[PDB]
Amino acid sequence: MKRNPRVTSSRRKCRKAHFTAPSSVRRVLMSAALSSELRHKYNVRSIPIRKDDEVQVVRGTYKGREGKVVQVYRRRWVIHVERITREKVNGSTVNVGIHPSKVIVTKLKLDKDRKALLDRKARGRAA
């Protein structure tokens, strides 16, 4: 049970905050679980999805399929994975959007801030 006076339990307020969220907040909202091997190696549970991350789909009709993130459509709350597509009625190809809460990250793209973020999250999850 929540105790903070400053935190709202109102369903109307929580839905408004979720859907009217800026781009920088959708990044945290659009986080993905790490795979078992990666969670063991980094001692972190979940990470925000990024472009060029390697991902596996674990829910839906594309469950089991793998690829790399080609697009993070934050406006639509979906990510696009390489070669996860569908043919239209005219025969063209369209990328299918998947919610990042239904995938697991298998390989991470690390520049310099991914490592720093991994260090911050590990310490809490390690102590």
Added chain:
Amino acid sequence: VKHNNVIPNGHFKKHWQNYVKTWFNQPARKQRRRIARQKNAVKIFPRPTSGPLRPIVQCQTRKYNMKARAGRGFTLEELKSAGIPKKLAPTIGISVDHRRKNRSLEGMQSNIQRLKTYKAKLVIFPRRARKVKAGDSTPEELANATQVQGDYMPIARGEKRSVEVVKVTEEMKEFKAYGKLRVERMNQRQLGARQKKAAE
């Protein structure tokens, strides 16, 4: 109006609905008042939270003649008889009321006694590390000085009930208490006529 009712008197002929005062903020008022009392208590840590010392007075008017309560402050004559300069009294937690006067001795003495009891309980901190001042306390007295809550010097309302056992003498009887009340009332209402005849 149709039956055996009271004559109605409803004072609702004006725009009374623009002047309705509800009390939905009553529990919030209680919390705001409680919070300020805790903030005020921390602002004065060793000083008592109940405010300065108050005297004892009789409530006025014949209905409340016999009840005692807290006054506004001590008279300038009471402070002088206890040895407390009137400029020092507010600074050490005593209220001063220059309007009030002392007409009877017993009211005055009980207030002077109250100040003496307060002075034996008061612990004064020096305004610096050096205790060059005279009214300051020893380091031991300051070392254990907490904050008291509530009324550290209560006021007794009304004379305590006490049924005594006495021997009824022969003068206690045949006193004619009703006759005394009537003759004294007559002496009051005959005073003006008696004084008129005396002058003539």
Added chain:
Amino acid sequence: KRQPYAVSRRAGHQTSAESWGTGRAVSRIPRVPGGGTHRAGQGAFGNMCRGGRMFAPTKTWRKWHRRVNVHLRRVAVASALAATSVPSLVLARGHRIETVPELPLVISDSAESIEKTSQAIKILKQVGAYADAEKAKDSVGIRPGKGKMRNRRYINRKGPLIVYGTEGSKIVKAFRNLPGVDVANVERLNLLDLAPGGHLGRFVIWTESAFKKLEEVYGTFEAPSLKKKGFILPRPKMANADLGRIINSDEVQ
């Protein structure tokens, strides 16, 4: 505990609208006089008009809170406390107490020191009071109706009510995440917990300190025998409610 609700004081009166009178073959309801828009000429200022005013608009000075005599409240708590000790009335309220050793169910003061939810579950299993908590854990579901859309989305049954006495115990923390299980202190027992829904027979687990304090609080038939000033335990109108033992007595028969 209710919060007041009301409609606006303006609420259907912020139009300018006058009646057309008779002589035009329309009803005498007030009408919007504008012109040039669909609102012109429509009914206004009436409980029967679209966009009108409610018949008796709800005002904020309704009587929301109700006064109960302090003495009557203490009688109700004492009557709801005694109903918690007869096991038949507890079963009638739906509590599962088939494996409870003794219904007054006094537990040792060691439970006052537990601080984990897993420890609390272990305590309930020892006293046979976990099937009641399981039933409350189940049956948790969405509330049907409009209260769903309001901020009351889940409902459930009531489980055991745990009563402690120490006033500083961490047993409150160990039990507060179990659904349907409430924790109360003996010095501030609530009738809303003792008789949920106005139905007497709550399943109560007493720690030993709480049970021993139960005579200091609520006292007895002696006048100064308790903390509550100006209160005596209520007296039954019938000294022996055993109807069979009175009808089939020797003097009656």
Added chain:
RNA sequence: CGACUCUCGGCAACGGAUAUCUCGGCUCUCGCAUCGAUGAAGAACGUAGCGAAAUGCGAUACCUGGUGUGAAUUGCAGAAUCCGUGAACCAUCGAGUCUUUGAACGCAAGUUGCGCCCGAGGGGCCGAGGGCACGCCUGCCUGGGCGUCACG
């Protein structure tokens, strides 16, 4: 046997009730105290590669700058950026810019109308830029009157 009218059922229409929802409303409680001649509120006109409105902004014009975060924005297209002084229709704010107006202030006003002064910079000419309302206060400068005097 048929047409017409009425009626019963099935399917199709017309219409938008009912049901389930809801980034809205209403009510209550709490905290805080911050508009303007240093030009406010309000009004106008502009401003995007593709925009009319709403939203934003002001010729630095859906933005410049700082800080934070850390790889997007996306309806289409092109550019920029990635182990980085570094993407973003991101957050936040200390640095900036801020057209015509409006208490509105050179005079006006159904007028982008009618004046005066200074002036970088290139005698005179052309200047970029800027001033010139009213009431009042303290001080100051230039004055008026035998109003009250003094000495010549």
Added chain:
RNA sequence: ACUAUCCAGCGAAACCACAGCCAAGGGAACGGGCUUGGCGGAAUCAGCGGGGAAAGAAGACCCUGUUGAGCUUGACUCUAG
């Protein structure tokens, strides 16, 4: 001569308890419906002004209401000047 009439195209409104042939009776004292009789046979077109006490308007005449308003005066009570 233009309409009306007939055609192609386009295309309203007023009004509507349900309806729509009569005689007499009784009845809120002038019935489409009720009672007793006369009767009474699909579906359609052009007109017509007897009826529908036809429509149009909560009678404007009349009265009532402890409803007004305009005007007058020797009404009552005031008032600028």
Added chain:
RNA sequence: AGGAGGGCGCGGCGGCCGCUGCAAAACCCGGGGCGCGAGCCCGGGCGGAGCGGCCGUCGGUGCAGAUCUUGGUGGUAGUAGCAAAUAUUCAAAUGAGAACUUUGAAGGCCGAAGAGGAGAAAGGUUCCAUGUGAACGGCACUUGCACAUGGGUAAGCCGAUCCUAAGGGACGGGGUAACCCCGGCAGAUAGCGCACGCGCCCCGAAAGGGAAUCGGGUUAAGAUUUCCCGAGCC
């Protein structure tokens, strides 16, 4: 008329007992029943995500009417009607389609105080070109004052602007609780020429007064004096 009792139904809240993607709510049915009745229970269908019953308690809680409100829909009815301003016809072209568009020919009307040619108010792009889904142009259209995309208004001389008219505002002053109402009530009148000399506010007219332009040419659309050529003027 009226009173009262006992029940039926709607929506919440506190409790209890349940249902549902093996299909909830709502809706439909010449389906089957229960109850005097308000109502209820089941079946079949549709639909695709929630709902019910019992105890207590609470309420914006039950419709046929109010010339009731809002919305939708009938008959009337393919009916009333589309009749002022004299009038059309032929051939061709275009086009899916021509009584209505375009060309030619013919017959007529307005008759120059016009149905002609240009302006002031008012409108604001209706102006010109190209194109055409629907709607609209009360029949129709290939067609447009519709719609879509573009283009188009050039001044020292034409006007405004300058002046004053009836009149309006307004400094000081006067009144006024303030908003505001008063301009002749005279107040050191706020300055003008060459130290010297003098000294009796603004707004208000594209029909009043008034610096100065003519001819010819040019565009899809301008210029009845703005662009070009030439010739002048202030």
Added chain:
RNA sequence: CGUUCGUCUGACUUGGGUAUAGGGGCGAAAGACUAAUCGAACCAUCUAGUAGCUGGUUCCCUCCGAAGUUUCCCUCAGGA
């Protein structure tokens, strides 16, 4: 709207500008006109004005069940 008709160098017709605003204006006078509004315009508010008067007033069954008469009332279609 058609035909007919009144006046037509004057107390003539008319454009623009300007003045007068609601118990006020303006009136060769009809209570005329003052934006389709005039024996007191229009707009918003007071205001959900008042009404002894007209209309309406929403589920079932069961039981009981009237009065239009007395008195008083600016009382006579109303109240007690």
Added chain:
RNA sequence: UUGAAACACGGACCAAGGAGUCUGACAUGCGUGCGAGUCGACGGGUUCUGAAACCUGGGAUGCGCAAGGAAGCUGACGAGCGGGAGGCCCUGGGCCGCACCGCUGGCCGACCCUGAUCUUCUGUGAAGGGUUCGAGUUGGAGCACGCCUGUCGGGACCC
């Protein structure tokens, strides 16, 4: 409406919405607690789910527990009788008799009468009263809350 099928008004149809409510003051009734008391309503304390809840302030806050009188001011010195449910005794009679009804009184106060005695000389009150008057007493029953109904102020059933 005395009287409607009416040549008396409203109603073309359908869906959704649509009218005795909320608050204050009294009153009777009923239900709950306590009871010569009752009310904890404004405040304070506390409250780890809480605008709940729980505790606490009354030796005088409000209604009650005492009237009458304009007021000054005085203020209940303790009942019988008839009928009575029920209980008891004897074998129809007797005893005790609640509530309620009826009758006659006593006491308090307003008004009027009355006056031994004490007394601060104007007060007191042994006795003795009254075709007078009271929302009195000789029964302590009330206080708080809840609900329906009724009257009244409010938009006040709706237009």
Added chain:
RNA sequence: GCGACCCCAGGUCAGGCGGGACUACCCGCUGAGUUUAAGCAUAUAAAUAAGCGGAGGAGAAGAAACUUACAAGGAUUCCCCUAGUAACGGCGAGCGAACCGGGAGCAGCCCAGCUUGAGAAUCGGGCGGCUGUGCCGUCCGAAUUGUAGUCUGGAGAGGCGUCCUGCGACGGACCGGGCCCAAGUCCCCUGGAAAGGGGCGCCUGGGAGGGUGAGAGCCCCGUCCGGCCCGGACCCUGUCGCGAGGCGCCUCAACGAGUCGGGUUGUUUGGGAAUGCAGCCCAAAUCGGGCGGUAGACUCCGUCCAAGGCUAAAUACAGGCGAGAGACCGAUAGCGAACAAGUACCGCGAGGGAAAGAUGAAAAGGACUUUGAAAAGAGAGUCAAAAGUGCUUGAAAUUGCCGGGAGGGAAGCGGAUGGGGGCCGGCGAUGCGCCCCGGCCGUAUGCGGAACGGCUGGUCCGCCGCUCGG
């Protein structure tokens, strides 16, 4: 003529201040009527609406020219009570406070007057300096028609004697911001999708809420308990380092004027021979002045000291900025506005003022063939589904078609049958006692548990060993 001053004038002189906006709360003025009185004029509506101004985070009020009658209390404000009371009122309708008492919160101060004359000791500005919301220096000015200091009735001055009197360093507390902070996406089934059902597990001081393809504690954000870091606020406070006032005693003692107060007139009040306020007339005092709720005179008594100024807190808050919640509404509801809503549109103008939410998990938004001038159709494709861009569901009125039935100037309706149709099978039975086949044990025992009555007796189960009826 040179001068000093007074009053005044002009400056785009140097530096400064003001005007407008906002409405919930607050301060000042001005001011109705509808309405009620069952008519209506006083009264009520109401010292309200409208109208004109002024502020703030609160405002205003505030330290007795106050109450009372007591054993007396002791600034303001707000709450409860006083109290629907005293009073007022065609004494009608109605109206209507205060004192005491109990709470919340408490706090008292600054001037003018006589008071430098051995020295205007005071203040502002220009300029310069610095240690900079200020300090110092210098020069000008203001001011004697009075700046500073002392003093304010509680006093005080004067006289005589004893006790009291800045800087920094490091934290706390207050406000804001950031970062981190538990546990399954294991197996089977159904479904387009598991977040549903079944099986096996884990977290919990976290089972508030939200998202994600269906009811998700463990998929994600969060929630709990905490920890870490950054930034404000310059008061408040906790440890460190470095003459004047009070008190006792004793002759002066100054205190606010066209103001008080009185008359009258108007208005207002519960204020009644007059509650406050205002205009006008009269017009003060210092052994005096103002009150003690009935006008007057006289004698006592109680009580205050106006006509100058400031002052936190408790209190108010339909506005603004920012939070939280609800037995509230659910698209004809709730604000007029869930949406480019004070919008479209209407009026010369002041003003008036709507309607309008929902495909699907994902546009996967319907390629292509054929007919047609096109719009479209017919096939086809996507989807779990055409749910086919006003697309969730999709009632009634009303309409078309197909099938059935009836009909001589209405039809519908109640009762009763019949003809035809549509339904239904808990619409309606097939078992029960006697006999040859399949297949279980008493009585007694050892043992284990657990009963009823108030020490005897009871049932069950598993095991034996005799037994035979089921």
